[PDB]
Amino acid sequence: AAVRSQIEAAVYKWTRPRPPRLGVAVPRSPPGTGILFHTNMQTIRYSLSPKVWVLVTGAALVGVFSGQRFAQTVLLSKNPPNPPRYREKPPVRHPHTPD
Amino acid sequence: KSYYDDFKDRLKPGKYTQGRCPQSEGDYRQESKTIGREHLNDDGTRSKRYTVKEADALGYHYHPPIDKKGQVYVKGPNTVIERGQTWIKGYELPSMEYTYGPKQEDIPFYPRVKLNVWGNYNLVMKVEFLFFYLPTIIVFGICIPVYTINFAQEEVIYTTMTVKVTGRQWYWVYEVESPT
Amino acid sequence: NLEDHFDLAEYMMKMHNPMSEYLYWIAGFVSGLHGILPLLHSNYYFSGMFLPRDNDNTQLCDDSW
Amino acid sequence: DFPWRWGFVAEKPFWVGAPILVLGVLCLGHIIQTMGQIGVRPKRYTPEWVEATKERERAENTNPITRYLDRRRAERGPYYLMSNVLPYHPHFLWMRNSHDYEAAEALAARREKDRELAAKLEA
Amino acid sequence: FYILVNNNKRIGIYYIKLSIIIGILGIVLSYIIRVELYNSGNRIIKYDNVNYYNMVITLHGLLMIFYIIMPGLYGGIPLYILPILSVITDIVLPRINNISIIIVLISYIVVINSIVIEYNIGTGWTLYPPLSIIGTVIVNMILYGLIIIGISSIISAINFMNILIVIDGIIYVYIWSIIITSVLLIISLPILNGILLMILSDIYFNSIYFILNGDVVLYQHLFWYFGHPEVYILILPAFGIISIILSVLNNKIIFGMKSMILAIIMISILGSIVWAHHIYTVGLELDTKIYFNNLTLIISIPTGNKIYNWIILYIGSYNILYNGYQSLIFSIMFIIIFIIGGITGIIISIDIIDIGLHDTYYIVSHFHYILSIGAVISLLAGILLLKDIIGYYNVIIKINKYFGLLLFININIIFTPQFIIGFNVMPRRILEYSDNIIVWNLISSIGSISTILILLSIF
Amino acid sequence: RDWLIGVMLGMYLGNLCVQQHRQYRVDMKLFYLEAPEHKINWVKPRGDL
Amino acid sequence: IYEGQTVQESELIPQEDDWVIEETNFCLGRNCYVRFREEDDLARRALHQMDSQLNKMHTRLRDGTVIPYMSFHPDEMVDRPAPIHTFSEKPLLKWTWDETYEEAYDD
Amino acid sequence: DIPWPARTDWGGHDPATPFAELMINTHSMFWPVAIFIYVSAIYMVKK
Amino acid sequence: SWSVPSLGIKCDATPGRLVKINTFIQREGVFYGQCSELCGTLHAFMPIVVEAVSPEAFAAHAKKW
Amino acid sequence: TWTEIWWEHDPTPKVAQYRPYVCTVESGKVYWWCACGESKTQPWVDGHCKCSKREGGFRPRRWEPEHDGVRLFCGCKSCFSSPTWNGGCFTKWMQSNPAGGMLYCFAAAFGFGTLTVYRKF
Amino acid sequence: YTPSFERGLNPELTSGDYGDMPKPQPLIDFFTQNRNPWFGFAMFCGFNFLWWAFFGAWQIRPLWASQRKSLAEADRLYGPTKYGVGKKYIN
Ligand SMILES: CCCCCCCCCCCCCCCCCC(=O)OC[C@H](COP(=O)([O-])OCC(O)COP(=O)([O-])OC[C@@H](COC(=O)CCCCCCCCCCCCCCCCC)OC(=O)CCCCCCCCCCCCCCCCC)OC(=O)CCCCCCCCCCCCCCCCC
Ligand SMILES: CCCCCCCCCCCCCCCCCC(=O)OC[C@H](COP(=O)([O-])OCC(O)COP(=O)([O-])OC[C@@H](COC(=O)CCCCCCCCCCCCCCCCC)OC(=O)CCCCCCCCCCCCCCCCC)OC(=O)CCCCCCCCCCCCCCCCC
Ligand code: HEA
Ligand code: HEA
Ligand code: CUA
Ligand SMILES: [O-][O-]
Ligand SMILES: [Cu+2]
Ligand SMILES: [K+]
Ligand SMILES: [Mg+2]
C-alpha cells in the first residue's frame, strides 16, 4: 500500500497538464477576468490531457495483447499430429450405378 | 403538470366520421349561397367553378388588379414618432399558446452559442490529407495483388487434354476426344 | 386570395374530402394486384390450379397432406 | 392526438417494448410462412433418403477440406456449427414418423449385393 | 386543376406520390420472390409457370430502379427544393416539368398493362440478348416503357442544368449533386437509346446484330456504359440529401464543402469509365480486365472522403438536442449501411474474387444494402426533414424509434444471409435450389414478411 | 485523437482474421500431405443412368 | 477554414466589473401540431397558419436588437407549408467588402 | 464440391484446383482490411 | 454460364465466343455447379456435374464409354 | 480539461462522486440536477448549493424523462451527456488518478482480448 | 419494489432532506429496472433473439431431437469416415 501510494503520487505529479500551445490566433483574456458564462451553456466534452491519454491508451493496448497471449497459451490448445493415413478400401460401387 | 389540460376546452371531440355529415343530410358539394362566399362550397372548400370550370388563369372573370397609375394597395407600417425620431414598431407574432395550445411556461433553457467550428487549421489540413490518402494507400496495397492474380488466370499452360462445353436450352453438351 | 396562398390549401388546412385519400390508397392497392392476379391466372392456365401446394412438384410420402 | 394503438405502445419504455416487438414480428412471419406447409412431408427428407445421401458422400468423398478443417479447428478451440444443432429443412415438424419403405427395401438389397461384390473382389 | 398544374412544388409531390404507388407493386413482387425462395419445392408458382418468376424478378428490378427510386430521389425531392435552394421563383422550364411526370405515369401504365395482356416471360432487368430478342411481345412493351422513361429523364436533366443560368445564390452541395447527375444522364442516356434501338431492330426489324458473326458482348458494353452511371445517378442525389440533413440537424456547417463537391465530380468521371466490371466473366483481354479493376478500386477514394466528412459533421454536436428524430437516425444509418455495401463492392471489384461471386446472391445483397436500404432510407430521411415544408400528415413517422429499429433489424435479416449463400453458392435469378441452402433462404424470407408488416404501422 | 482509438480497435479486430488465415494456410499445406481425409484411387465413375 | 470572427483584447474589456454573459433563453417556446379552430374557415385557417411560423420568430437582446431564426439554406425561409409563390421579392445574399466610394459620404 | 447446410463458407470452401485456393486466399487477404475500414469508421459515428 | 465453384471456374457460354479455361484438379470427387446466366424458363434446371477420378480410372472409363 | 487548462471563464464544478447516482424517475415530472457538486441531496439541487443560489455561474440543470424507469445520473458533474451519465465520471477519475486509470484500462482490455481471442482463435 | 437508499462514496452529499425528490439507489436496481417483470421478460426476450441471430433459436431442439438422432446414426454408419473430434459433428 505504501508503494501503491508512492507510484500513484509519482504518476500523478508527472501527468499534470501544462498550458496548451494554442494552434489558433485568439486574444489574451483581459487581466482580472473571472467566470462570465454559466453552467447552462452547451456542455463541452471533458477530454484527458495528452500524457494521461497516452498512458491509459497504452495500458489498454498492453492489456489486449497480453490477454490475447493468455488465451493462446492457456485457454486454447495446439493441433496434435494428424492421424496416420492408412490405405482403406473404397466402396465397391457407386450407390447410383445401374445394376 | 399536464399541458394538455390547459387547452382541453378548445378541443371538443367530433361527431361525424371525417368531419362531414352524409351528403343527404347536408349537400357540401354545392356552392355556398352566402354573400361574399361565391367562390367557396358550403363546407368551406373552394368550388370547382372557381378553381377549374371558370379559372381566372383561363380568361374567365378578367379583372386587372393594377390601377391607372401602376399602383396596388399596400399596408403601411406602424409608425410612432418619439424623441425627435420616427420609429417603426414591428409586428410580433401571437403567443404560441394561441396558435399551438401549450402554455408558454417552464420553457427549457437553450443558451445562445456561436457555431460549433473545427479549429487548428494545420491539424485539420493534415486530417483531410489522411481522409484522402489513407484510402489511396489501401488501394495501392490491393493493386499489386490484383495484377498478380489477373496474370495467373491468363497464363499459357501446357494443357494436354481438351473438353469442349456447349450450353443449350436447357442442357450442357460435352465433346471429348475418344481414346484410340 | 388567402385561400390560394398555400398549395393544396384544403389538405394543408385539414378540410379536404377524405375520398381523395381513399382513391390514392385504392390506386396503390390496384397497382399491387397487378402482381398477384396474373400469378393466379398464369398458374391456372398452365396447371389448372390457382396456387400450388408446397412441394407438389416433388415426390411425397404416402401420408403427406 | 394519437389513436389507441400508438398511445398504448408509446406509453411503455422503449427497451421494454422494442425487444418484445422484435421477437413478435419475427415469430409472426414464421407462423405465416408455415401455414401453407402444414403436413407436407417430402420423401427426400425421410431417414431412408438421408442415409442414401450419406452413402453417396462416402463414395464421392464430398467436401473433404470442410471435414479436415472442422477437425483442426475443434482440436484447437471451441468450434460450434449451426448444422450440428438445428434442422436443415422446415418440414421437420411433421416428419417425426415418416418413412419411405420402398427405398428401405431397395437400399437393403443393394447393400447385400455390394457385400457379395466386396467378397468377390477380395477373392 | 390537378393534371394541368405546372407548379414545380406540386410536381415534386406528384413524383413522391407516384413512387409510393408504383412502389407497392415493387414490394409485392419482392414478397413473391422471397415467399417462393422460403424452401425448396414449388410454393406459390407452379413448375409449369416458371416463366412468371422470371418476369417477376425482371419487373421488380426495372420498376424499383427506373419507376420508384429514380423518380423519387431525382424527380421528387429535387423538383420541390432545388428552385428554393437556388433562391429562384420557380423551375426554369415549367411546361417541360409537367410533361415529365405525365410521361412517367404513362410508361408505368404500359408496363403493368403488358403484365395483364401479354404472355409473362422474363429476361432480367439487364435484357441480355439473344434471350431478350427471342422472347414474346412483353419484351417489346418493356422496351417502349424504357425508351419513354428515357425521354422523361433527359428532359428533366435539361431542366436542372438550366438552373446554373438563373441561380441567384450559392451552388450548395445538394445542387451540385443534382447537376452532376444531370450531366451523367445527358452523356449516358443517348448511348442507352442506341443499344435499345438495336434490341428493337433485332426484335422487330429482322436485324442480325445479336446472331452469329455479330457479337452479343457488344450489347453488354453499351448497356453497362449506361448501367453503372445509372447506379451513381441513383446514389448521388441521396448523398446530396445526407449532407443537408447532417449539417442542419447538427447545426454544423459542412466541413470540406469544396472536397464534397469535388468528390461528387470525381465519382461521376470515374463512374463513366468503369462499366466493364460487370463483364468480368465474359472473357475480356487481360489488360482490359486490369484497367477496369484498377479504375474501379479508385472510386473508393472520392467516395471515402465523403463518408469521413459526414462523420465529423455528426461528431461534436450539442447533446441537449434530441437525437431520436427519424430523419437524423436515417441519415446516420445511411453511413453505417453504405459502408457495408461499398466494401462488398470493393470485394467483388477484384475480378478473381468476382469469378466466384458473379451471378450469386452476394451481388444481390451488395446492391440491396446500397439501394433497398441506403437509397430508400435517404429518400425517407429527406422527405421527413421536409415534413413541415411539404405539409403531409396522418402518419406516425417523425418520432418513431420502433419503426427505425424494426426496419434496420429486419432489413439486415433479409440481405445479410444473402452474402453467406453467395459463397455456398446459390446463383441469382433462380427459384429452385438445393436443399442445403434452405436455412439461409428461410431466414431471409422471414425477414421479408416482417419488414412488410412494419410498413403498416406508420399509418 | 479519438479516431486513433478506432484505428487501433480496427487493427486488433483485423489481426484476429489474419491469425485465422495464417492457421488456415498451415492446415491446407498438411491436407494433401498427411490428412487421412485426402483419398486417392477412391472415386469410381458412376456411369450413365 | 472558418474559425469564428477575430477578437482583439481591447474588445473583451468590460465597462463594469459586474458584466457577465446575458442569460436570454433562445428556446422559442413549447409547440406541437398547429391547432386550427373548427369555427375558422379556409381563409381564416390560412391566417392562423401564417401566424405560427417559427422562421418569423426572434429573440430580443438587452440592447433591443433581435437575433432571428436563421438557417444554412433558404429552404427554411418559406412559409410552412410552402405557398404556391414563395420568393416574389428576390432574396438578397449580402456580400461584404472593404471598397468604398466618395459619393456615399458627406463632410 | 456441394453446398452444405448452415455454412458460412466465408470466402469460399473446398477448393480442388490451385486457382480455387488462390481465390479463397485473395478474399481472406482483404477481409481484415475491410474489417479495419468498417470498425475505424463506425467507432466515430456519435455525438 | 458454366460454373463449377469447387474448380474455381465461372465462364460465360456466349454465342460467338469460344472462351478458353485452363484447370488442374488436385483431388478426386464430384463437383456440382449450376448455370450462372439467366437463359430462359429452365435456367435453374441445367446443373453442371464434373467427377474427377484417377488417371488410370479415367482411361478405363473413356475406353468403355 | 477544458476548464482546467484551456478556458478560465466557465464555472468549474466540484466532483461529488466519481460514480453515477442511480435514481428512479417518473415521466411528466421535472427534475433539477446539481451542477456544482456541493448539494447534500445529490444528484438534485437542495436549495442551498451554488446552483440554487445562482452563485458563480452555477444554475440548476433542468431534466425530464420520456418514460418511467431507473436512470443513471452524473456525479462527476462534467459528463458530456449531463445530467445523464455516459461514462465521463470514469474518464474524469482517470485524469485525477492516472495510475489507477491504467490499472482498470489494462484489466478491461485484458478481459476483452481473452474473450475475443478465445472465441475466434 | 421499495428500493434501498445508497449513500454513495461521499455520504455527506446525500445527507440532506430529499422530500419528494427520489433518493439514490443501488446499481442492481438499474439493471433490473426496479425488478420490473416486463423488463425481465424483455431482457429474456433480448437474449432469445440474440441467440437466434448468432447460433439459431435452439428452441426447435426438443422437436428436432428424434431427427437429429437419425441423422447421427446415418452419418456414422454410411457417411464418410470422421476422425477424432470430427466425429462430434454431423451434417
Ligand atoms: C516493463 C518493461 C517495459 C517498460 C515500458 C515502458 C514504456 C514507457 C513509455 C512512456 C511514454 C510516455 C509518453 C508521454 C506522452 C507523449 C505524447 C503526448 O501526450 O505528448 C506529450 C506532451 C504532452 O504534454 P502535456 O503535459 O499533456 O501538455 C498538454 C498541453 O496542454 C499542450 O501540449 P502541446 O500543445 O504541445 O500539444 C501536444 C498534443 C497535441 O495534440 C494534437 O495536436 C492532436 C494529436 C492527435 C491527432 C490524431 C489525428 C488522427 C487523424 C486521423 C484521420 C483519418 C481517420 C480515418 C482513417 C481511415 C482509414 C481507412 O499532443 C497530443 O495530444 C498527443 C496525443 C497522443 C498522440 C498519439 C499518436 C499515436 C499514433 C499511433 C500510430 C500507430 C500506427 C500503427 C501502424 C501499424 C501497421 C501494422 O506533448 C507535448 O508537450 C508536445 C511534444 C510531444 C508531441 C508528441 C507526439 C504527438 C504525435 C501525434 C500523432 C497523431 C497521429 C498521427 C498519425 C495519424 C494516422 C492516421
Ligand atoms: C410505400 C408505401 C408506404 C410508405 C410509408 C411512408 C410514407 C411517408 C410519407 C410520404 C408523404 C409523401 C407526400 C404526401 C403529400 C400529400 C399531398 C396531398 O394530400 O395532396 C392533396 C391531394 C388531393 O387533395 P385535394 O386537394 O382535396 O383534392 C381535391 C380533388 O382534386 C378534387 O376532388 P373530387 O372529389 O372532385 O376528386 C375527383 C375524384 C372523383 O372521385 C369519385 O367520384 C370517386 C368515387 C368513388 C370511387 C372509389 C373507388 C372504387 C373502386 C371500385 C373497384 C371495383 C373492383 C371490382 C372487382 C370485381 C372482381 C370480380 O377522382 C376522380 O375523378 C379521379 C380519381 C383517380 C385516382 C384514383 C384511381 C383509383 C385506381 C383506379 C384503377 C383503375 C385500373 C383499371 C385497369 C383496367 C384494365 C383493362 O391528396 C390526395 O390525392 C390524397 C393523398 C393521400 C395520401 C397522402 C400521403 C399521406 C402519408 C402517407 C400514407 C401512406 C400511403 C402509402 C401508399 C398507399 C398504400 C395503399
Ligand atoms: C446505387 C447502387 C450502387 C452503388 C453505390 C454501387 C457501388 C459500387 N459497386 Fe455496384 N452494383 C450495383 C449497385 C451499386 N453499386 C448493382 C445494382 C449491381 C448489379 C447489377 C446487376 O448485375 O444486375 C452492382 C454490381 C456491382 C458489381 C458486379 C459484381 C458481379 O457482377 O459479379 C461490382 C464489381 O465490380 C460492383 C462494384 C461496385 C463498387 C466497386 C462500388 C463503389 O461505389 C463502392 C464505393 C464505396 C466504398 C468503397 C465504401 C465507402 C468508402 C470508404 C469506406 C473508404 C475506405 C474504403 C476503401 C479504401 C476500399 N457493383
Ligand atoms: C432500388 C431498387 C430495389 C429495391 C427497393 C428492392 C427491394 C427489395 N428487393 Fe430487390 N432487386 C432489385 C432492386 C430493388 N430491390 C434489382 C434491381 C434486382 C435484380 C433484378 C434481376 O435479378 O433481374 C433485385 C432483385 C431482388 C431479388 C432477386 C430475385 C432473383 O433475381 O432471384 C430479391 C429476392 O431475394 C429481392 C428482394 C427484395 C426485397 C425483399 C426488397 C425490399 O422489399 C426490402 C424491404 C424494404 C422495403 C419494403 C422498403 C421499400 C420502399 C420503397 C422502395 C418505397 C420508397 C418510396 C418513398 C420513400 C417515397 N430483390
Ligand atoms: Cu442457362 Cu441459364
Ligand atoms: O454497378 O456498380
Ligand atoms: Cu457497375
Ligand atoms: K421454391
Ligand atoms: Mg452474368
Ligand SMILES: [Zn+2]
Ligand atoms: Zn449545485
Ligand SMILES: [Zn+2]
Ligand atoms: Zn459524470
